[PDB]
Amino acid sequence: SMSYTWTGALITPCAAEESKLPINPLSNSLLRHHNMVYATTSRSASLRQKKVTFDRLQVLDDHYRDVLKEMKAKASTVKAKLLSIEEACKLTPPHSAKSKFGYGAKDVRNLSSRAVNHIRSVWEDLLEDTETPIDTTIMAKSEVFCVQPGRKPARLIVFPDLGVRVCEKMALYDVVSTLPQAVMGSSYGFQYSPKQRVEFLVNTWKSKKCPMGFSYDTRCFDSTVTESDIRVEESIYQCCDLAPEARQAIRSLTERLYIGGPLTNSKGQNCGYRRCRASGVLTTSCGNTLTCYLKATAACRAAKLQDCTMLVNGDDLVVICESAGTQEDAAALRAFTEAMTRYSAPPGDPPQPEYDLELITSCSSNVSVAHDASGKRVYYLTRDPTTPLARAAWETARHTPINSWLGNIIMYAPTLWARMILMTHFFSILLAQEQLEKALDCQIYGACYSIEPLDLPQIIERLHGLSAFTLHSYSPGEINRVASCLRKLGVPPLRTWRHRARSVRAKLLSQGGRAATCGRYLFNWAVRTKLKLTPIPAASQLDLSGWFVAGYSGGDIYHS
Numbered sequence: 001s002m003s004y005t006w007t008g009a010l011i012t013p014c015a016a017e018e019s020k021l022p023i024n025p026l027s028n029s030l031l032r033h034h035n036m037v038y039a040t041t042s043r044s045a046s047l048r049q050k051k052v053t054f055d056r057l058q059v060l061d062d063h064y065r066d067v068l069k070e071m072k073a074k075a076s077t078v079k080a081k082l083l084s085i086e087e088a089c090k091l092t093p094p095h096s097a098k099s100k101f102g103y104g105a106k107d108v109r110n111l112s113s114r115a116v117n118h119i120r121s122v123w124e125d126l127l128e129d130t131e132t133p134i135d136t137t138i139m140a141k142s143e144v145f146c147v148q149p150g151r152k153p154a155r156l157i158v159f160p161d162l163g164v165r166v167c168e169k170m171a172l173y174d175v176v177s178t179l180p181q182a183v184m185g186s187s188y189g190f191q192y193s194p195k196q197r198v199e200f201l202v203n204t205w206k207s208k209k210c211p212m213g214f215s216y217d218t219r220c221f222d223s224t225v226t227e228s229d230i231r232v233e234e235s236i237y238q239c240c241d242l243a244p245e246a247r248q249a250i251r252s253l254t255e256r257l258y259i260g261g262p263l264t265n266s267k268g269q270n271c272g273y274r275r276c277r278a279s280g281v282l283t284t285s286c287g288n289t290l291t292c293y294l295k296a297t298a299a300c301r302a303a304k305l306q307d308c309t310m311l312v313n314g315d316d317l318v319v320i321c322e323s324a325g326t327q328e329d330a331a332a333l334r335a336f337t338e339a340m341t342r343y344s345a346p347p348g349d350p351p352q353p354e355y356d357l358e359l360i361t362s363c364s365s366n367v368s369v370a371h372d373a374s375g376k377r378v379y380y381l382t383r384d385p386t387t388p389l390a391r392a393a394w395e396t397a398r399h400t401p402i403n404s405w406l407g408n409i410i411m412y413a414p415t416l417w418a419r420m421i422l423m424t425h426f427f428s429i430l431l432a433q434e435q436l437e438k439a440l441d442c443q444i445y446g447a448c449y450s451i452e453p454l455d456l457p458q459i460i461e462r463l464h465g466l467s468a469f470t471l472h473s474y475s476p477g478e479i480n481r482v483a484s485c486l487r488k489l490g491v492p493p494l495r496t497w498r499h500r501a502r503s504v505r506a507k508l509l510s511q512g513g514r515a516a517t518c519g520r521y522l523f524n525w526a527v528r529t530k531l532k533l534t535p536i537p538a539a540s541q542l543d544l545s546g547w548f549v550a551g552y553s554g555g556d557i558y559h560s
């Protein structure tokens with residue numbers, strides 16, 4: 001069927017949309033070519049709609065069914081708990097979109113009588129009505145990027161009302177938080193911190209006689225998800241031990257929301273119908289991961305690829321297997337794509353066989369290689385720094401809800417660019433404004449987390465280890481990329497940052513306390529007479545468990 005059907009009503013913005021990087025003194029410090037940075041707006045919605053709208057072709061086979069059963073079998077071991085209204089309410093981000101029924105996230109988190117009362121009726125309605133399509137809002141997503149030799153048309157997010165969202169959590173939070181791992185095991189990507197992901201990719205790579213890997217980019221995965229895919233996804237959830245009300249809720253949510261439903265713009269106009277995966281629901285991440293995993297695993301058997309290890313993060317897929325030879329691999333890969341195309345997962349860019357782990361891009365990142373104080377090779381996760389930097393500038397010139405830069409510093413603490421540029425730039429600003437103590441919100445695998453800048457040293461050592469503060473001698477490949485990026489964006493070169501870091505480090509050291517700790521560990525690369533960095537006491541006191549359990553992008557989740 002058609003992924004989408006449009007009435008003609010436009011995807012409207014519910015507020016003024018900013019698309020250009022303002023000429024700000026502070027942003028200008030980080031990057032000079034401000035005209036290269038842009039934010040997508042609803043003005044590009046039609047370009048997207050045309051890209052995501054098409055008929056889906058899907059032919060299933062024996063391999064798909066075999067793998068599906070294997071998956072359900074693991075699923076049968078899961079026992080999911082039905083969250084309470086209070087629990088699910090406590091998971092709602094403070095900035096979440098208000099309900100059109102007289103309340104907002106604030107009232108939800110405060111267990112406001114009005115909110116709760118409405119959440120109850122919505123739930124009661126899910127238990128009674130198994131058919132009525134639940135309404136959803138469609139908005140153009142506002143994201144920041146750098147221009148390219150044109151521009152990316154805004155992505156379209158689709159999400160139901162606040163009430164329904166709390167209800168999703170009640171019935172499915174525990175499930176989407178535990179089922180993926182139980183089913184895919186080591187292959188489930190959101191369970192790993194950046195360090196563990198590299199570990200897994202490196203060990204997996206070395207477990208092959210002669211490794212061959214490739215990333216598989218599905219063309220607009222969300223609109224390639226069929227009603228069949230979503231029901232198959234429910235059949236997997238249905239294998240869990242569920243409370244009676246949770247089973248019905250899931251059965252209803254599937255038919256009324258997850259498989260499709262009416263689309264409404266910000267003005268209340270009927271935009272069209274959706275027959276594919278909505279981006280703004282709680283099951284989006286789990287569902288896509290399961291679907292991507294299922295199709296890929298069946299495609300591997302069908303394609304004759306040997307000993308295929310999957311690492312799946314939602315629609316993002318990486319595959320590592322036993323090479324069978326250059327020509328045999330090219331053939332096998334093409335066969336893999338045909339199987340995937342039949343499973344309704346056509347490729348965007350044709351996949352290419354890789355024989356060098358550092359050449360595979362998954363989750364926009366890749367495994368590189370540097371050295372620690374001792375001088376031994378240390379693997380770590382990195383990526384092209386264009387977008388992170390572009391967004392850093394943006395978030396520097398404008399008050400933005402989520403600070404992707406803070407999230408990038410954490411996820412990419414050991415990289416050349418995050419340490420040399422992100423930490424320097426931001427700490428410098430925070431110190432100049434005396435905000436080193438204000439906690440900031442950021443995201444990790446979709447979930448919102450409140451973090452204090454001064455705590456970064458602990459978090460980094462904990463997530464990455466001490467080597468993140470001593471890495472050096474990066475690969476020529478990683479260096480070239482950072483170099484080109486800076487050249488392209490008009491970002492000051494190494495020397496400029498070192499001088500700035502040397503200044504910040506000193507200023508932080510003079511403040512003592514946690515700030516001094518920031519200056520000693522974060523900026524140890526700036527000095528000649530380096531300090532002897534030892535494990536930070538409070539690092540062992542840290543509990544970053546809930547940080548890397550599952551993916552929640554689009555799920556509207558907040559881990560307090």
Ligand SMILES: NC(=O)c1cccc(Oc2ccc3c(c2)c(=O)ncn3Cc2c(F)cc(F)cc2F)c1C(F)(F)F
Nearest residue numbers: 415416419420471472473474479482483492493494525
């Ligand atoms: N084009 C440039 O501006 C430019 C010019 C010369 C070199 C260069 O790469 C660099 C810069 C510093 C480097 C290395 C490579 C390295 O391999 N090994 C060590 N240091 C010191 C260093 C470090 F260990 C970590 C850190 F967090 C900042 C640092 F300073 C660059 C760049 F953009 F970083 F890629």
Ligand SMILES: [Mg+2]
Nearest residue numbers: 191192548549
């Ligand atoms: Mg974990």
